[PDB]
């Protein structure tokens, strides 16, 4: 009976047993870094398998990962820091800060560049951006003529892509729907990044470093991996049929190793388990860690609320693959998902459980009812491939023994 | 880190920084007085800019302001003091106390003085007056033939206007709707004033002074500004295009300096930040301050409930500009607004947050979940012009650090 | 500052001031006995005016009153004592215990004795009787051909009326509606009385005396007023136009002084303020007073729940004068009304506030949120005449000062 | 101290008085074993009447009973132990673990073996099995052509019946409805048994013994009654009209005494009151008893939630005799019923009250609001016959005196 | 109607002024019946179609037809039309005119 903070460590050992038996030994994932904490105390930390298969290098605690969309909560906090200085209000039109967006219209029909559009019921608000109710979309969605336009203009990334270019190009594109009336995962968070720059006078990497990473002691989180740390950078793998994987990004000669001009508020960051733990633990503590504060306790409680109309779940409003059964009983606040109904989600957990993931199968959650949190790192695109984040939840909630 | 009552004072300093940067330095407001308190302790008090631009006089803590519609909560408390003595019941017809109102009818069509009307489903009740569900209106609404009548009869104020005249004139006017069936901001609170007089035997200035202002130590709150205090009286300014302002009321030769015969339960009062703080803090304490009680703890808890049908928000029942997005997730009790849904309001705060404002951009709130309150004084007509009350909420809730 | 149990006694003195000014001095009521208690402590007890106008006798604390329908909670407790011994279940058909009621049918049309009827969806249950969803009615309702039948058969009372006769006569009468589908105030509680007899083997006066009155020290509560105590018995008065009253029952030569054979579970009891206080205080304590228990804490919590379908209020299901505005936001359990929505009721009080009244303007309530209770005795038929029970609530809740 | 753990033992004595008066003396039941516990303390334990009428043998505390469907919670816990090791997820298709079930279809019309079927909206999930939303059924339901097929194939039990045979036969049978769209009591739990075997590598009797019975000190719980304990085994009786009973299973020469090849996760177990108390008390403690843990506290809290769509009760989704009035205000989790609305159920108790029963009138419940639990053993088929489980609840909740 | 002597949508109280303030039965027994305001006055078309809210003594369903029977408004000694009209002026209607149908003395 090893018990720390009401958690049986013997039960937590099933994490490593499970990742070995189900993913690593059968060659579905290259390697995992898994951290669990409760009541401020780290109770599990376990590197397993390889960060680089080709170079036979193991995952270590200090291994760097593409956290991709786990950037979105950091960008969300950055912008909400400025909400707390009265620099904007959530119900303000975006076109107040981006005047060229005043006349954005809703897609009716046509192909880029001759798309016909209709008037929106109301202009897009900052709250719409923070909650993906903008009516913006993502190139990779591959559902509509609008995301076809995003792909032909490389608005997800590509040579000479800047935030200045994203904002300039989106001014001339239609929205998937009248702002507020639906939910669709979007570049909206990359735009929030642009608004941090606009309001702070700083470049996004500088705002993050000054106002989040330095205060919290996150020295290994950056848009561009410094040359001296590139040895610690994991390879990224993508799914291959037969539950296998292939090389997707070599850490040597990775775009993440160059400073191209694109600071992606949506997917740009590289981090390690320790750095993301400090960010998570700060949020779990109401915005403060070791005497550094990144956000007001109340402002954070506001971000963790469901901001979807009529306390609806994602499938009640989502047009995308976030319509599907895994997101049942989950809502969405200002940059986090929020568990609304545990039974409906078919996954053990608590009402209020908040977090997000990255397209490379990175995941984190904060159960505010249990003061419990997990950070899970691996590099397998896409995150939709395996239900590993759900198995980990089963095991972890399984290890509660008070 | 200065922390008083779980509030970072360094974070509260963003209030002054914000009002300077956004309103004062750019010449949108003349001057501000801002007070914040929590758990009985004043944690912020800051005069800024000028009370009188023309005479180059600064705002001081003791500066007197037209609080306009922040009178309504005081008139509400006055009447509810009499509820507690069994002097009436909320479900009683108004025409019990004002017999000439027995045959009030609902506007169908026509112009003053030949307006056709229909029978109401039921007579107007006291609760209707206290909640603006009377079907009365305001001259300044400028929406209907009925408020056109209010303007031609100067029922908002003007030469030889008394409450006796308001009551006499309203007896011959139609209502905007069958009482209870909708909400419309109204002279109803001026009528509550008349009912305080009717039931107490006292003139409203005397009831207020005896039963509210003296007990609470509010020596600088009155319908008429005494000659010896007129030096402290701020000028009132109105909005001019280009986010500028012009002189609206000179404190020397102001109708607020004369005792004309009109005691406005709806907008009549002049007060200072300290006096309104004592009134607010009394409410925050459940009706008692420094051993003086103006209202029962339970009676007040009743006034702070949502009194709108089916726990609806103002936009679900309001016919006016209180229909609009800023009042989403806000209800209405007996003289206070009540926050119902924080996420829906798109503004940080707590469920139960109650208060009201004045047309000159004066505002106060009491967050009963956080034991937190704000009093904000400025003189810019109309209150709808800037979202300053929302920015202050963002910053203040931002400064909570427990 | 006299304060007992968080109640300002100076504020409670407004009770006597109010009853004098509004009812006694203007000759609307003959006399009042008013008791208030909180946290087990009696904080107000006040006789006022006359128990007998004709004989110029004052109301004293020991004065006996017709509590009429305040019997119903006592009969409810009696039956639920037997629920706790497993003697029946609430969802059981009544015709299990009263076999002659197996074929009760619903009124379609016609006059007694040729009434046509329809099959009910389901048989009447014990829970239907305890909640007035039986589809039974009362002679005095004066709305339907069915209550016309009750009057011609004198089922409310009259010479040689017994419970045995009520049960025998109701077997041959139609119901106002299919049991469960509506609410209508009824002899159902008189029938509950009959079921106490049926299941206990005892006459109702004996069950009450043995299992309620003796345990609780209620020596002055009985269906028949002993000759020796008839000096203490108040006269009953009925309303006369001009807000006046006339003699309705002379205490000398009162049917309440004779032992006719009718033990009315619905309206039969005579009691004093002290006895009803002990009954009320027992309920307020979870069924125990001074080491005597009349009901389990849990069983009582069950009786105080709203037992109306879909947590509806009385006006959502009532066909009677309990449809009207005063009963808005009030439900009904097993013999008590239950406040559901305070704001909707337009009267100060707490969610869960339970109690009932008698047709002679007797009233009691228990606010379980405030551990507060009131017993009000007067003798003015009918209870619908004046809103005094609401004025008392205003004043009493007004006197809470913690 | 006639009070243990806030329960009056004098009031609990009404249990024996009631079972004697209502069931035993009138010969409706042969014998009862009744245990009640609160806050970890057993406050009532009472054998009454005979375990074997023919052999005139009394019920003793150590008497063994057919608990029938009270097996289902044990099988549920067994499977959820494996959920906690990440061995599966609730939203996974069953056909992942039982590939021959990929093409299960929904009954349209026809008789076995020529039944026509339609495509289901989605494949059956593990959660569907644990909640009886599978669309599987039971032979004994006697409502549909589908259960007629179950009977002709003896899928409830009979010679040469194994779990391997149940799974093989169900692969070729239609479902009553598209999985998830309704509720119907089923062999689904017997299938959960098969999945425990599939995932654990162990036979179900071994998994139970190793992972539940040995840890909890339940030496007298087994699928097959050991020869040396067969003297303690009660006879089973079935209902006969006139509220009488006949011999149904002689304990000598009982199929429960032989090891036929059928390990019934649904109804197979024989147990005693002490063993089932230890299992119940473990659950009441959050999955731990005397330092042995069978399930995580959080995992169990998940199983006790209502898992029916839109927090509906059983009658809102059940097609069976679980449609009927007794199951009003009761939902269903992963192997337990859950009380949702106390008033609606017409039975005293608490929201969250969970448990289940056996077809032989065995019953248990755990009131997590009162830390109270009951185990009731008798042998009368079917459980639907008498409302004894409701009478016991009335009496027990009646005995709460804090 | 064909001589233009009236219109169907005209209030009855135009031709029977004592009927201007007819009210709808809420509760009570003759002679102390409580009533509510009708949405609109009774029209001639209401009479011709039995949507008046009048009733018949013999209906034997409501306190209102009990009143018709005790006043013998279906017939009986010294009954005239003048008496029917005079007595109905002081009685409540079963419902707000137009809102339902009930066979009646309307004809
Ligand atoms: P982000 O990683 C998309 C980043 C921009 C990519 C441009 C090509 O979204 C991934 C979705 C994962 C959400 C939750 C997944 C649980 C592990
Ligand atoms: P009151 O100030 C109107 C007073 C009577 C004026 C007669 C000409 O209403 C102003 C509305 C402000 C409500 C909330 C505003 C937030 C600052
Ligand atoms: P009970 O007094 C009727 C007793 C049977 C009378 C048979 C002629 O009902 C009276 C209704 C009062 C309920 C609440 C009133 C508040 C004071
Ligand atoms: P289980 O006992 C059916 C076991 C399989 C038998 C195959 C012939 O279900 C019985 C239903 C009882 C549920 C609740 C009853 C309360 C005592």
Author numbering:
A (entry chain H), B (entry chain G), C (entry chain E), D (entry chain F): 8 to 409
E (entry chain C): 90 to 196
From the paper:
Structural analyses of free and substrate‐bound forms of this homooctamer esterase suggest that EH7 presents a more opened and exposed S1 site having no steric hindrance for the entrance of substrates to the active site, more flexible R1, R2 and R3 regions allowing for the binding of a wide spectrum of substrates into the active site, and small residues in the conserved motif Y‐X‐X containing the catalytic Tyr enabling the entrance of large substrates. These unique structural elements in combination with docking experiments allowed us to gain valuable insights into the substrate specificity of this esterase and possible others belonging to family VIII.
